[PDB]
Amino acid sequence: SYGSRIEREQHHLIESIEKSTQYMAKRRIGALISVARDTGMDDYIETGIPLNAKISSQLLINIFIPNTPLHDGAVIIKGNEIASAASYLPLSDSPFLSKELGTRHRAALGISEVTDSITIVVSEETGGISLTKGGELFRDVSEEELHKILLKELVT
């Protein structure tokens, strides 16, 4: 299993993001998940706590539980692993980002301006799910909309 093993991994990654963000959105647990693609993110992985862990919805949920050792920052997914938790992501300086969106959104926008990553945000204030890519924000997406974007962008 080579190319076909990859697709099973990518679809499991999508499902893992969908299940965990749905769980966290319902409970208004803030989350920040950046999926590396072609642009290396080892610099930002080094700022976090190394996990090098199998991807699962359960582990993603456990990471972001508030006031816990792994929650205070971003999860970065690299290849087929959860590489790090509590990672830094650079804050966008954009004045176009709505002032009602917090640091998670600004950090997701920031990494999206200097990498080709796909970053998913769960708002702890609204439960809304947002995505950043290439300096753009997809704000408060539906489950269907998130699904289509993750399929387009993570299944190659």
CA atoms of 48 and 61, how far apart (whole Å): 17
CB proximity list for 81: less than 8 A, separation 6 or greater: 51, 52, 53, 54, 55
Contact 140, 114 (CB under 8 A): no
- Tell me the technique behind this structure: X-ray
CB proximity list for 95: less than 8 A, separation 6 or greater: none
What is the experimental resolution, given in Å to one decimal place? Answer: 1.6
- Binding residue positions: 72, 89, 102-105, 123-125
Torsion of CA 137, 35, 30, 110, to 10 degrees: -50
DSSP at 122: E
CA atoms of 133 and 139, how far apart (whole Å): 12
| CATH number, domain 1-156, options 2.40.50.140, 3.30.565.10, 3.40.1700.10, 3.90.1150.10 | 3.40.1700.10
- Binding residue positions for ATP: 72, 89, 102-105, 123-125
Q: What share of the chain is helix, strand, coil (3-state, %, to 5)?
A: 40, 25, 40
Q: What residues are paired with 84 via a beta bridge?
A: 50, 76
